[PDB]
Ligand binder design. Structure first.
Ligand code: A1BUJ
Ligand code: ATP
Ligand code: ATP
Ligand code: CL
Ligand code: MG
Ligand code: MG
Length: 1173
């Protein structure tokens, strides 16, 4: 990372953007490398801008009764804004007065205009000086405005993240990741560039006043006709803007919903594949896209007319201005040409610059208002004592989850809870599924506010969640969690949590890079990493919500005896548990039942109780037909224009006066009106944008289909930020920005080519004069696009870390707030912001360099032309000047065309990224009895890696019960996934004589019914979550829910079976989701079932629910039951034990437990009575 050249530069180098030379030379030859990017200027760093805006916003909040964010932004940026606006206005003024000199210079070609031939050289000098000053005034101001806009955007994003970290729990249920992602994605690049157009709300009226004053000279009272036409057109454009904004308002919610569903699906792709649910998800997304595309199409239709307003107004203004003048007296061709010259500037001011500025103000003020409304939301109440007597006490606590029901005080989740615990004691909390154990910890943490009662303690806490949270980084980073590294503590914690055995089996040992969510590890490994993180922190109170759910009895016993009771014997602990052995040595015991305290006391009492354009064009067949139709109409118009033009030169008082020496004006007039003569009407414009929108629809469908069928090895590489970035920003670009940009480019190209051909055919000496300018423009464009494409790719990639950080911050907010690590995460977010800023700044600077170089080349050519024309003009007409000035007039449209081509190529990178995503590789009654045979099965996760399971062979009789067991991290889930071909495999598997190499993947996967270890619940109704294909009547669903035991749970919510679940099922407790998975497995009438720990955190009472069902729901079925619970192993006939990456088979569990002394000694005694009666 080398220092940016901007900081240490020169004044002339800054004015001409010369400091960008080293990068442009470097990327023209080769690929840009890591050491090619500069550090950002210190003024753009996120910390400084965040601090400044935060101070101004706090002053605004603390001073005024009606605060406004726009006031703080003004106090931060107004002076520089006005400073650049003044120079922008001075630059724009020079265009208004250019016809005064150019018109006289052109009139001097006529020998009858003896007066203007006297001072031609002075007019030429003045024109050259004007041309030089305009370039110097315009481009630096535009760069300054872009820089200011970038600074505002960065500051606001920092404020948004800081506010997000403080949101109250009651507010979180109303905002999803989709809404925040949409908010960031919408303003990420548009806000910066709007500032370059903002000043035209007052620059344009002054231009109109000056131009009307100047047109009064030539045509006094007849100019008002054209002005009235323009004032009607402006009203029309205002109305069109209102309709477009109305269409945008109705579309945003549907985009947020689609983003939520897509992110959830791609996160749970493994369950999606195991369920064979791909088509259902595709149908859901297609239904959402169909609703949003209609609004997109209507907005595009209204934007087409708004854009075409400029091109169709050219003929009307001139004709309406001239007709009264040419009727009540004569008119000369010179006056007509001068009127056209002035009217071009007038039309650009009225129909292009002012409405764009008005729309920019609308968009920016709306975004700022939305940000302020977000910034004024309800916050987590931190009001509590940070120092007490270390006697943790809870008195008369009654709590409600529903804010409306609680304020109306709707049933309470907690009712009159009392307890008191001393320093260094242990309290064990027990109860049935859904009793309110997690909710009690929520109250103690302060995330759930009680209506009645109160809780007192010191305030330094540590927290271990039922659902583990893993952040991006290594294992050591996940454990030390942003504080200093201590060797003795780290070793003690690593040893105590039984992690050394799993740590010693990794290539990086401990520096393995864990992704977001820890999908590389098993369930028990993630749980133990979370426990180690909780124990590493020093605090006065440790809350542990059921940390032994995914562990075998031996590991659980070791951890409980060596960590909770030995390593923290002198601290205050609250452990949620259901094992009766753990309750014996608890100092105090609390038992919950349906929100009430069934018992509080002691145990002793309880016993007593470039080929990218071509693909894009050929995606859809109708676009080709539309383009050919446009070309045919264009050819007909060109031919008609040529025929009409040749007639005036072949044919010979009237309203128009033409002399012999003044006829050269005719061609000059044609070039001034071709913009209107070759304008694309609604017979060509509307079908084009319609078909481009259709192309966007097709591309999104293909992208989603391609993603859903990739192999797991490919899918495991992608990050959540990358998925969100590609599906949000690139798709939005393809939907909105590409069609109209393409329309503008095509219109400009048609105008240029038509004018060139028509002029050249009659005068084949202008084409040859225009050749060198065209060549120079093309060479410069080719040179610049070699570096520009790479820089745009880097900037596009730079967005992903921001979204990834936001997603991971949202997932683990409660842990972050409990530990008190908000500043650390804020620093990481600022890092991501700066990383994006470097590339974005480098792209903007190079773009400014290119535009200035094009402008300078045009100026040099015009300066050379003007003096030659004046010099070679003698007593006769200046033929050389006549040809050269007309040639230079045509290049004026070519410059605009080249800039339009640059922005089109900039937008096409999104198409290239979508295509890269589309080309991902594809991973691609018979079940009569249920027999299986496995022969030499080997399994691995990546090709050429460690083999988790090597050379396994066994067989199963049809309709038999098999118990799969092993230590946490052995590879039971690996064997379960190998059955469904979810990883890389070798060997053969046969079901009733049919091998998996004889049929397709879908048919093989349809033979199984599965219960995965990770439960997937998406946004939708209860009914939709139970079956997405809608093939069962509500009677059958209700009967199944009766059998599983989900009656009261479903009837607890206002919409019985129609309630919509949000936040991945936030309202449901942990065991209810397992019950929802068992109901899914029951609804599928599958002959072979693979169940991965169906009872993970259930109490023995609730386990009786899953019992009896395996004996009624699945009677004649082959069941493979992976379980850590010893009781469940009493209903198996075959046993498979995984150890040393190998599988061993047993007939009786007494024989199994005879050969393992430690494991037998770990068995609970009541279980031992049930095993050895
Ligand atoms: C006689 N005569 C001009 O005086 C032209 C001018 C012009 C007028 C006054 C001062 C400076 C230039 N302009 C253009 C001119 N043509 C083609 C022309 O024949 C041409 C154009 C106009 C329409 C399209 Br499509 O392309 O490009 C221009 C692009 C932007 C602007 C801008 O005012 O921002 C003006 C353009
Ligand atoms: N955000 C919420 N809004 C409404 N009800 C909720 C919410 N979160 C939990 N509940 C409900 O509150 C009750 C208590 O659930 P909680 O998760 O605290 O139970 P638990 O004892 O931890 O359960 P488990 O043993 O399954 O882990 C349940 O009926 C649950 O559905
Ligand atoms: N997606 C993956 N990519 C690479 N290695 C993996 C992946 N998933 C698991 N592993 C590794 O493979 C081994 C087997 O893990 P597996 O999930 O099969 O264990 P398990 O016996 O099911 O454990 P638990 O009882 O904790 O669920 C572990 O050491 C784990 O780290
Ligand atoms: Cl003129
Ligand atoms: Mg719980
Ligand atoms: Mg597992």
């Amino acid at each position: 990372m080398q220092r940016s050249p901007l900081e240490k530069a020169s004044v002339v180098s800054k004015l001409f953007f010369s400091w960008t030379r080293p990068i442009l030379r470097k990327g023209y030859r080769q690929r840009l490398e890591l050491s090619d990017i500069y550090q950002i200027p210190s003024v753009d760093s996120a910390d400084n801008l965040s601090e400044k805006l935060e101070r101004e916003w706090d002053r605004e909040l603390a001073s005024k009764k009606n605060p406004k964010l726009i006031n703080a932004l003004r106090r931060c940026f107004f002076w520089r804004f006005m400073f650049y606006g003044i120079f922008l206005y001075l630059g724009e003024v020079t265009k208004a007065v250019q016809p005064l000199l150019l018109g006289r210079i052109i009139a001097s070609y006529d020998p009858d205009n003896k007066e203007e031939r006297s001072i031609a050289i002075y007019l030429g000098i003045g024109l050259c000086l004007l041309f030089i000053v305009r370039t110097l005034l315009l481009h630096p101001a535009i760069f300054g405005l872009h820089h200011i806009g970038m600074q505002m955007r960065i500051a606001m994003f920092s404020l948004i993240y800081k506010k997000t970290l403080k949101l109250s729990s009651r507010v979180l249920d109303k905002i999803s990741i989709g809404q925040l992602v949409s908010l960031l994605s919408n303003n990420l690049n548009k806000f910066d560039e709007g500032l370059a157009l903002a000043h035209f709300v007052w620059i344009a009226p002054l231009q109109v006043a000056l131009l009307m004053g100047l047109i009064w000279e030539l045509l006094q009272a007849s100019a008002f006709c054209g002005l009235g036409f323009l004032i009607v057109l402006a009203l029309f454009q205002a109305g069109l803007g209102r309709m477009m904004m109305k269409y945008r308002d109705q579309r945003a919610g549907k985009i947020s919903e689609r983003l939520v569903i897509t992110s959830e699906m791609i996160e749970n792709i493994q369950s999606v594949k195991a369920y064979c649910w791909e088509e259902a998800m595709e149908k859901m997304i297609e239904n959402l896209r169909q609703t949003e595309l209609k609004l997109t199409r209507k907005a595009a239709y209204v934007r087409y007319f708004n854009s075409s307003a400029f091109f169709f107004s050219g003929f009307f203004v001139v004709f309406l201005s001239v007709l009264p003048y040419a009727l009540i007296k004569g008119i000369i061709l010179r006056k007509i040409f001068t009127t056209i010259s002035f009217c071009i500037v007038l039309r650009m001011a009225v129909t292009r610059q002012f409405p764009w500025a008005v729309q920019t103000w609308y968009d920016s003020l709306g975004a700022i208002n939305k940000i302020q409304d977000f910034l004024q939301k309800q916050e987590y109440k931190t009001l509590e004592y940070n120092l007490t007597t270390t006697e943790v006490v809870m008195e008369n606590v009654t709590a409600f989850w529903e804010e409306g029901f609680g304020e109306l005080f709707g049933t309470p989740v907690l009712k009159d809870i009392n307890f008191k615990i001393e320093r260094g004691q242990l309290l064990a909390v027990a109860g049935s599924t859904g009793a309110g154990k997690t909710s009690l910890l929520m109250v103690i943490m302060g995330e759930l506010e009680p209506s009645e009662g109160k809780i007192k303690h010191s305030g330094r806490i540590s927290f271990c969640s039922q659902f583990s949270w893993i952040m991006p980084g290594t294992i050591k980073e996940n454990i030390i969690f942003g504080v200093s590294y201590d060797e003795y503590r780290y070793r003690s914690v690593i040893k105590a949590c039984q992690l050394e055995e799993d740590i010693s089996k990794f290539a990086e040992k401990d520096n393995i890079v864990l992704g977001e969510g820890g999908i590389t590890l098993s369930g028990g490994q993630r749980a133990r990493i979370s426990l180690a993180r909780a124990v590493y922190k020093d605090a006065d109170l440790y809350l542990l919500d059921s940390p032994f759910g995914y562990l075998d009895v031996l590991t659980e016993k070791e951890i409980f005896e060596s960590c909770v009771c030995k390593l923290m014997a002198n601290k205050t602990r609250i452990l949620v548990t259901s094992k009766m052995e753990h309750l014996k040595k608890a100092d105090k015991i609390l038992i919950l039942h349906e929100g009430s305290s069934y018992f509080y006391g002691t145990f002793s009492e309880l016993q007593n109780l470039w080929n990218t354009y071509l693909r894009y064009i050929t995606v859809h067949k109708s676009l080709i037909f539309v383009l050919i139709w446009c070309l045919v109409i264009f050819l007909a118009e060109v031919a008609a224009s040529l025929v009409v033009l040749w007639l005036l030169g072949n044919t010979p008082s009237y309203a128009v006066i033409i002399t012999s020496t003044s006829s050269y004006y005719v061609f000059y007039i044609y070039v001034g009106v071709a913009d209107t003569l070759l304008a694309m009407g609604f017979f060509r414009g509307l079908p084009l944008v319609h078909t481009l929108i259709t192309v966007s629809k097709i591309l999104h469908h293909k992208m989603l289909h391609s993603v859903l069928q990739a192999p797991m090895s490919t899918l495991n590489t992608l990050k959540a930020g990358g998925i969100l970035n590609r599906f949000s920003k690139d798709i939005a670009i393809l939907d909105d920005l590409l069609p109209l940009t393409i329309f503008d480019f095509i219109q400009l190209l048609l105008i240029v080519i038509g004018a060139i051909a028509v002029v050249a055919v009659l005068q084949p000496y202008i084409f040859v004069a225009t050749v060198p300018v065209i060549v120079a423009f093309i060479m410069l464009r080719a040179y610049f696009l070699q570096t520009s494409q790479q820089l745009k790719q880097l900037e596009s990639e730079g967005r992903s870390p921001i979204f990834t950080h936001l997603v991971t911050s949202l997932k683990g907010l409660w842990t972050l707030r409990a530990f008190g690590r908000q500043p650390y995460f804020e620093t990481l977010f600022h890092k991501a912001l700066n990383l994006h800023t470097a590339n974005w700044f480098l792209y903007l600077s190079t773009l400014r360099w290119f535009q200035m170089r094009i402008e300078m080349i045009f100026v040099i050519f015009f300066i050379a032309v003007t003096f030659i024309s004046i010099l070679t003009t003698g007593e006769g007409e200046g033929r050389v000047g006549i040809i050269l000035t007309l040639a230079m007039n045509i290049m004026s449209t070519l410059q605009w065309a080249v800039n339009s081509s640059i922005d089109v190529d900039s937008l096409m990178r999104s198409v290239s990224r979508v295509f890269k995503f589309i080309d991902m590789p594809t991973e691609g009654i018979w079940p009569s009895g249920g027999q299986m045979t496995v022969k030499d099965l080997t399994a691995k996760y990546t090709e050429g890696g460690n083999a988790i399971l090597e050379n396994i062979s066994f067989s199963i009789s049809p309709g038999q019960r098999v118990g799969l067991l092993g230590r946490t991290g052995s590879g039971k889930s690996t064997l379960l996934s190998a059955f469904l071909r979810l990883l890389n495999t070798e060997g053969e598997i046969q079901i009733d004589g049919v091998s998996w190499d004889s049929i397709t993947l879908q048919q093989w996967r349809k033979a199984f019914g599965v219960i995965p270890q990770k439960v997937f619940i998406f946004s939708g109704t209860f009914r939709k979550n139970l079956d997405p294909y809608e093939q069962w009547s509500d009677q059958e669903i209700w009967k199944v829910a009766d059998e599983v035991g989900l009656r009261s749970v479903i009837e607890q919510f206002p919409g019985k079976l129609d309630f919509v679940l949000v936040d991945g099922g936030c309202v449901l407790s942990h065991g209810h989701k397992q019950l929802m998975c068992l109901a899914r497995s029951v609804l599928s009438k599958a002959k072979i079932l693979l169940l991965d720990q169906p009872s993970a955190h259930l109490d023995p009472v609730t386990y009786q629910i899953i019992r009896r069902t395996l004996k009624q729901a699945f009677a004649d079925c082959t069941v493979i039951l992976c379980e850590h619970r010893i009781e469940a192993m009493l209903e198996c006939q075959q046993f498979l034990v995984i150890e040393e990456n190998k599988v061993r088979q047993y007939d009786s569990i007494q024989k199994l437990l005879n050969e393992r002394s430690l494991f037998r000694q770990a068995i609970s005694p009541s279980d031992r009575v049930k095993l050895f009666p």
